[PDB]
Paper text:
Cathepsin K (CatK) is one of the most investigated cysteine cathepsins, both by academia and pharmaceutical companies. It is expressed in high levels in osteoclasts, where it serves as the principal protease involved in bone remodelling. Cathepsin K (CatK) is a target for the treatment of osteoporosis, arthritis, and bone metastasis. Peptidomimetics with a cyanohydrazide warhead represent a new class of highly potent CatK inhibitors; however, their binding mechanism is unknown.
The final crystallographic models contained mCatK residues Ala1 to Met215; additional N-terminal residues derived from the propeptide, Gly-Arg (98p–99p, propeptide numbering), were visible in the mCatK-Gü1303 structure. The active site cleft of mCatK contains the catalytic triad residues Cys25, His162, and Asn182. Gü1303 is bound in a substrate-like orientation, and its P1 to P3 residues occupy the S1 to S3 subsites of mCatK (Figure 4(A,C)). The cyanohydrazide warhead reacts with the thiol group of the catalytic Cys25, forming a covalent isothiosemicarbazide adduct through the connection to the C-atom of the nitrile moiety. However, a Z-configuration at the CO–NMe bond was observed in Gü1303 bound to mCatK, suggesting an E- to Z-conformational change in Gü1303 upon binding to the enzyme, most likely due to a "configurational selection" that we recently reported for an azadipeptide nitrile inhibitor of the protease SmCB1. The nitrogen atom of the imidate moiety, derived from the warhead nitrile group, is stabilised by two hydrogen bonds to the backbone amide of the catalytic Cys25 and the side chain amide of Gln19. The NH of Gly66 acts as a bifurcated hydrogen bond donor for the carbonyl oxygen of the P2 phenylalanine and the noncarbonyl carbamate oxygen in the P3 position of Gü1303. An additional hydrogen bond is formed between the Gly66 oxygen and the carbamate NH of Gü1303. At the P2 position, the phenylalanine residue makes nonpolar interactions with Tyr67, Ala134, Leu160, Ala163, and Leu209. The P3 benzyloxycarbonyl capping group forms nonpolar interactions with Asp61 and Tyr67, and the phenyl moiety of this group is stabilised by a T-shaped π-π stacking interaction to the 4-hydroxyphenyl group of Tyr67. Gü1303 occupies the non-primed subsites S1 to S3, and B-factor distribution showed that Gü1303 is rigid in the mCatK active site.
Author numbering: -1 to 215
Write the structure that this text describes.
């Protein structure tokens, strides 16, 4: 196909530093801003930390630290005509009243698109064509908690048990094992400096391609 065999948007400067969401159920907000940060770098050449807090406080269809959908975050940025920067709307790991200000607007959104349910070929073509893509996974296993290196594969991962939201920032192959390059929001001391390589084309391992989406900019 058109899509490269390997792409790593970290090497292209599309990916901001790894964040830590803390105990707040804001994985959906980190996943959403990571996809928007990628599109902002692609469309403008600038990499900026965007505000997950803006989403936690202001996306009324989501439950703040109580969880949320990435699609509701992209719909909010579009309807709201903006999202603020992290720097001036910082992450405080607790739900507060919405303090969105358009003077601090750092990005806009024109809606979102969904990858077809369970289609890893279509997720690869989207990551190649678009950039980083928001994904939901089964991150429930202790093997995931203690991940260090290599390509994560666990036969106990359940593609119908989506319980965490992360960001696919590329894909490739390592020691013969195809992978997705996944940015987590558990800080830089988790995983491989905050990243995990997750098995690719292993029958939608951990449900990586079951609820993937990206923003239009
Ligand atoms: C992350 N820290 N966190 C608590 N999670 C697991 C969520 O927020 C999940 C992420 C997710 C997204 C899509 C599919 C599967 C999992 N979202 C979630 O639990 O949404 C619940 C919700 C509550 C209120 C309004 C909308 C959704
Ligand atoms: Cl979602």
């Amino acid at each position: 196909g058109r899509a490269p065999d390997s792409v790593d948007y970290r090497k292209k400067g599309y990916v901001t530093p790894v964040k830590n969401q803390g105990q707040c159920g804001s994985c959906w907000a980190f996943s959403s801003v990571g996809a928007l940060e990628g599109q902002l770098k692609k469309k403008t050449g600038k990499l900026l930390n965007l505000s997950p807090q803006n989403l936690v406080d202001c996306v009324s269809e989501n439950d703040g630290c109580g969880g949320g959908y990435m699609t509701n975050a992209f719909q909010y940025v579009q309807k709201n005509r903006g999202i603020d920067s992290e720097d001036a709307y910082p992450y405080v790991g607790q739900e507060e009243s919405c303090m969105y200000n358009p003077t601090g607007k750092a990005a806009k959104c024109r809606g979102y698109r969904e990858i077809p349910e369970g289609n890893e070929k279509a997720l690869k073509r989207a990551v190649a064509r678009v950039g980083p893509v928001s994904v939901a996974i089964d991150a429930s296993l202790t093997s995931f908690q203690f991940y260090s290196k290599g390509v994560y594969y666990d036969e106990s991962c359940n593609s119908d048990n989506l319980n965490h939201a992360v960001l696919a920032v590329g894909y490739g192959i390592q020691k013969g094992n195809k992978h997705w390059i996944i940015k987590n929001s558990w800080g830089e001391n988790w995983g491989n400096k905050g990243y995990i390589l997750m098995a690719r084309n292993k029958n939608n391992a951990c449900g990586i391609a079951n609820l993937a989406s990206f923003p239009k900019m």
